[model samples]
Target: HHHHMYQLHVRVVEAKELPKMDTFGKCDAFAILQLNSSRNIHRTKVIEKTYTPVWNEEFHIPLEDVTIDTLTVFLKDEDKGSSDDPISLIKIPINQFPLGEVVDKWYSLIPVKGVKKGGQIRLTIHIAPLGATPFQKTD
Candidate 1:
């Protein structure tokens, strides 16, 4: 069996009670999706002035194998400085995300070593195999 490239479609539905970073008002937030050790990162559009933001945004990422690396998702507060405010990050093993189908679930934002969280994110991820579906041997 030969390996084929695949598309990882990640849907960022909504974030609840995201931690407020900018003290003057509600948090302006966005989500970042990354594969561990890969500089290629994708992000959602910024939602301003809301502790709870609904993105309903999807990102399509190409991969040689869906299970090759860990998936890192980060929710951050958009800032004007050199660094964006990190709220929480979830590190998920790629294998844990279902392949060749859609998996919809709410992932609780896990606090990073020195960071904290406010709540969770609801998302759906689909792994679509390229060229052909698994097992139908294409020669």
Candidate 2:
């Protein structure tokens, strides 16, 4: 087995009071994930869909000889106007966002095996609104 392996999962959503905004209006949302000892940061935009108002994504980080302690997640209000001000969102810690609302829950799993050079980690992203009824609900 490899020395180090891990999985990180996250869900992005809008505030309960702030449901899906008008398409013509601003859909301000962004996210940032900081890796241990790595200067490179991962970023992405958040948007609302007809079904839901949340964005979900996952990332896997391989740790062999690398040391990691904490993974910081940031949510900000994205800017929508100029190229210079493209990301106008203010950075907020993961705990800052409305936990029970915007961000329901999050999870991180570390693999028992570490990753080697040229190995690829899998990532998944999903977006869902706060309380939109599905096309059909079946028990």
The per-prediction tally of clashing pairs is 0, 13
Please give each candidate's TM-score: 0.84, 0.38
Per-residue accuracy of model 2 over 1-139 as CA lDDT, tens digit each: 5322322334333322222233555435455566444664676555533212245454443322222234444443444574312221222233332222323433222211221111111223212223322211212
lDDT, candidate 1, at 108: 87
Model 2 TM-score, 2 decimals: 0.38
lDDT over C-alpha atoms for residue 115 of model 2: 14
Query: TM-score winner among the candidates?
Result: 1
Report, for every candidate in turn, its global Cα lDDT versus the true structure.
0.77, 0.34
Best by lDDT: 1
* RMSD vs true structure, all candidates: 4.1, 15.2
**Per-residue lDDT tens digits of candidate 1, residues 32-84?**
99977687698998899998999998787776556666778999888876687
